[PDB]
């Protein structure tokens, strides 16, 4: 949980208008649009193994509602989303390749992000 009320910042606007937008448009992003539905997907022990679920739809909603105080918290949510995927799933699963491809784009956009955070 954040330690301060959220803000609008140059870095958070970049996460919303560059990072989320570029990831969402790829045809392999769809498994990350919504929380993992472990009932419909019949995923045994998903919530026993994954204690902090996260998805890109939740991240997008948090950005639009100014939930985050800093883009560092948003980047951690993306990291949680990818790490959960690798922890729960099997090496040869389709989902792992899809996460790897999205995570590479995520890191590329983080490398290109403005390095200081200023409130808007």
């Amino acid at each position: 949980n954040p330690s301060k009320p959220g803000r609008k910042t140059n870095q958070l606007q970049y996460m919303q208008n560059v990072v989320v937008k570029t990831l969402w448009k790829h045809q392999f992003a769809w498994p990350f649009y919504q929380p993992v539905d472990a009932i419909k997907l019949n995923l045994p022990d998903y919530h026993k193994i994954i204690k902090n679920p996260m998805d890109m739809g939740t991240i997008k909603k948090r950005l639009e509602n100014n939930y985050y105080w800093s883009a560092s918290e948003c980047m951690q949510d993306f990291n949680t989303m990818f790490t959960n995927c690798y922890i729960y799933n099997k090496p040869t699963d389709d989902i792992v390749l899809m996460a790897q491809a999205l995570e590479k784009i995520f890191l590329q956009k983080v490398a290109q992000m403005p390095q200081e955070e200023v409130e808007l």
Partner: peptide
């Protein structure tokens, strides 16, 4: 969508 969830997609 999934043929087998997480393992193999159908789309």
């Amino acid at each position: 969508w999934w043929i087998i969830p997480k393992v193999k997609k159908g789309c």
